[PDB]
Design a protein around this ligand. Sequence first.
Ligand SMILES: Nc1ncnc2c1ncn2[C@@H]1O[C@H](COP(=O)(O)OP(=O)(O)OP(=O)(O)O)[C@@H](O)[C@H]1O
Ligand SMILES: Nc1ncnc2c1ncn2[C@@H]1O[C@H](COP(=O)(O)OP(=O)(O)OP(=O)(O)O)[C@@H](O)[C@H]1O
Ligand SMILES: [Mg+2]
Ligand SMILES: [Mg+2]
Ligand SMILES: [Mg+2]
Lengths: 73, 73
Amino acid sequence: GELVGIITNRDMRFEVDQSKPVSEVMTKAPLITAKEGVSAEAALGLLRRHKIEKLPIVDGHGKLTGLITVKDF
Amino acid sequence: GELVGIITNRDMRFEVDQSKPVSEVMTKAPLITAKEGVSAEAALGLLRRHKIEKLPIVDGHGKLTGLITVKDF
Ligand SMILES: Nc1ncnc2c1ncn2[C@@H]1O[C@H](COP(=O)(O)OP(=O)(O)OP(=O)(O)O)[C@@H](O)[C@H]1O
Ligand SMILES: Nc1ncnc2c1ncn2[C@@H]1O[C@H](COP(=O)(O)OP(=O)(O)OP(=O)(O)O)[C@@H](O)[C@H]1O
Ligand SMILES: [Mg+2]
Ligand SMILES: [Mg+2]
Ligand SMILES: [Mg+2]
């Protein structure tokens, strides 16, 4: 139940073998994340700062509780 | 005439003020580049390794000569 990574379109867009596991392709932890109760402006600022489009949202124990994307904005 | 940076869609996609200069928004050098005469395989390997969609090509003296993009592939 621990957030171990994140796998997006850039990771899979050139992989010819579609039978590979996620572990070989994913971006492993640590990640750029935000805590629970993050506002829209804070998430947008983080995304603009780190030049990313996704933002996992974790609790105080480091467990995954939410996800934010640029698609929302 | 020096290759001082690169500016892409991620840099500009949340800049409300369109009158800003390029320098205030661009990604400054050094950049992930390749040498002249780089094959398609090497360029694709660089793009996959660094998770980027562009690749400037400079000469032996560091002056910009060309560009490679994922659009080509
Ligand atoms: N929060 C994050 N922390 C760390 N790495 C991340 C994070 N979000 C995305 N990445 C990684 O950054 C790279 C690209 O990020 P992003 O998710 O914006 O790409 P994408 O949505 O696949 O892009 P495109 O839509 O242009 O194909 C990928 O390798 C992805 O795994
Ligand atoms: N060769 C490079 N070296 C270093 N940084 C780069 C290079 N090419 C692009 N970047 C930077 O990486 C970020 C995203 O790279 P990329 O050029 O793939 O984005 P993009 O094509 O705008 O993405 P999207 O498809 O999500 O709109 C931007 O901040 C951009 O300035
Ligand atoms: Mg995207
Ligand atoms: Mg995109
Ligand atoms: Mg893209």
